[PDB]
């Protein structure tokens, strides 16, 4: 299938409680493979997946150096952001950044990302062209004019087209046993009455990888979109994910309901009923 590499940075100021915390995680698809935390005893870019551990001293030294540099830069950005928004120095604020690349089945760059936020709101985003910027407000427009003057987009694109794609491809090869393996959902339907008149049918998907999945209920073959309770996909802790979808049905009409499961691990979609 296709694949993505993403890094996620989180910087949070905490006045009176020392300098901003900087935490960084790296993912390939839905598999975390590195982390960095400035609040750790000995902050270093550290492995969180078996296939990354083979990388040598120079690797970890490099990545760590990047994380420390970025840490300092985003501490200054927090200061900068206070001035742009006319905010006081007593409040706690957060800068978030996500970036990375998507490749196709053949390892070709499908598209690149570089998005930043301030206090949970969009701040500035590299456009899909990797040459221009979308700024969310007049403060971000200030950053934009700085980044235009400095050919920042130019640098990003050279990364997203070069090192990002190359390293992702290397990771996909080093971790092929897992990163290139989809585990299909294990599926079943449960039934619990609410009253004389109504019963809950709940369609389960367990143990699947990657997280992307579609669970839908049809009644008489018609999607029950506005009528289905759909819980957030949740990690199991063993690499896999879980989800369910529930519908409230009239007692005696359970066989008019079917559950439909779409997932990459499944050759074709599955249809389930209550047994």
């Amino acid at each position: 299938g296709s694949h993505s590499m993403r890094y996620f940075y989180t910087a949070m100021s905490r006045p009176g409680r020392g300098e901003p915390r900087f935490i960084a995680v790296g993912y390939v698809d839905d598999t975390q493979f590195v982390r960095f935390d400035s609040d750790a005893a000995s902050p270093r870019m550290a492995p969180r997946a078996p296939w990354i551990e083979q990388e040598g001293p120079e690797y970890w030294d490099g990545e760590t150096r990047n994380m420390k540099a970025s840490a300092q830069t985003y501490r200054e950005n927090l200061r900068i952001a206070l001035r742009y928004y006319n905010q006081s120095e007593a409040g706690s604020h957060i800068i978030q950044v996500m970036y990375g690349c998507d490749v196709g089945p053949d390892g070709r760059l499908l598209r690149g990302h570089d998005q930043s936020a301030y206090d949970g709101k969009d701040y500035i985003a590299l456009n899909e062209d990797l040459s221009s910027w979308t700024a969310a407000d007049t403060a971000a427009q200030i950053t934009q004019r700085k980044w235009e003057a400095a050919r920042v987009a130019e640098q990003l694109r050279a990364y997203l087209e070069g090192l990002c794609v190359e390293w992702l491809r290397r990771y996909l090869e080093n971790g092929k046993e897992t990163l290139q393996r989809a585990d299909p959902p294990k599926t079943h339907v449960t039934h619990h009455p609410i009253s004389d008149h109504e019963a809950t049918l709940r369609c389960w998907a367990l143990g699947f990888y990657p997280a992307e999945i579609t669970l839908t209920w049809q009644r008489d073959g018609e999607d029950q979109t506005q009528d289905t309770e759909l819980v957030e996909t949740r990690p199991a802790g063993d690499r896999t994910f879980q989800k369910w979808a529930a519908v409230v049905v009239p007692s005696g009409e359970e066989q008019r309901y079917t559950c439909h499961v779409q997932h990459e691990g499944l050759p074709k979609p599955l249809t389930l009923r209550w047994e």
Partner: peptide, 10 residues
């Protein structure tokens, strides 16, 4: 290098 050895002031 896998992260970007880039990082920019706002």
């Amino acid at each position: 290098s896998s992260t970007r050895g880039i990082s920019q002031l706002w």
